[PDB]
């Protein structure tokens, strides 16, 4: 259980974004139904009033939280990978529009999952804004918790992979548009019961053998890291 509070741009806190520039759900319950429109931007996908100004090459930092900002972020049980997708706001998340900018499953070195390092990062992870057409975008941050992903939701609806999905409203002002955004995958649609990384046993199988769900990170991506960029406590 976890949600996005707001974003930092080049280490500058953009302030509380909930229901403002984040399409926030009413709570931190996971999404589990792979076929649900809830897979797009969570249970309450609607245009919210603001879109954060950025330029190509900016560092965009998502900040997640559990109950209060900068608390314990997400339960230590929720081991899994972190992905960030972009789509043109045009789409409102519909159709084959989601392009991956970032993937992080397991760091062999440190022996930590992305979720472990997100907790350490006080809920902060970042992507470098790509050189796409200036305009309005959704950035979809996705945490997959696998603590029950040994089952499929479709077979056993009290277990299954859990998706913590947050769509940020981002307006890209300055960019040379040197990497125009290609068509992408649909959500719902890209994840099915057979897709790798959806069904996996973190209790029996080694984390080095884990293989995150496709698609692959777009070559136009400039991402990206899991690490604190600024102190929320200084406000
Ligand atoms: O640990 C391995 C073990 O995990 C089992 O799954 C556990 C999770 O480990 C545990 O973290 C999880 O905790 C949930 C709890 O179910 C929720 O009800 C609770 O929801 C809170 C929320 O946190 C608050 O932020 C919000 O305000 O209110 C709601 C109250 O409804 O959130 C926590 C996570 O923070 O519970 C699981 C039990 O299924 C696996 O089942 C097992 O297979 C593993 O071996
Ligand atoms: C999953 O979502 C689809 C599409 O909204 C729906 O038809 C189906 O009933 C859902 N599954 C469950 C268990 O509710
Ligand atoms: Cl849970
Ligand atoms: Cl540029
Ligand atoms: Cu949870």
Describe this structure in words.
By secondary structure, the protein is mostly beta strands. It has one domain (2-235): Distorted Sandwich (Coagulation Factor XIII, Chain A, domain 1), CATH 2.70.50.70. The protein is 5% helix and 28% strand. It has helices spanning 38-41, 114-120; strands spanning 3-9, 12-13, 52-54, 59-65, 82-88, 99-104, 106-107, 112-113, 124-128, 135-145, 162-172, 225-226. It has a 5-stranded antiparallel sheet. A 5-stranded mixed sheet has the order 3-11-10-5-6. Strands 7-8 form a two-stranded antiparallel ribbon. β7 and β8 (112-113) form a beta hairpin. The longest helix is centred in the middle third of the chain and has 7 residues, at 114-120. Residues 1, 28, 66-67, 75, 77, 147-148 line the site of a molecule of 4 linked components (BGC-BGC-BGC-BGC). The PDB classes it as oxidoreductase. The entry lists the keywords lytic polysaccharide monooxygenase, metalloenzyme, AA9, oxidoreductase. The assembly is monomeric. The entry is titled "Structure of LPMO in complex with cellotetraose at 1.39x10^5 Gy". The protein is Auxiliary activity 9.
How is the topology of this model organized?
Elements lengths: L2 E7 L2 E2 L24 H4 L10 E3 L4 E7 L16 E7 L10 E6 L1 E2 L4 E2 H7 L3 E5 L6 E11 L16 E11 L52 E2 L9
Parallel strand pairs: 3-11
Antiparallel strand pairs: 1-2, 1-4, 4-9, 5-6, 5-10, 7-8, 9-12, 10-11
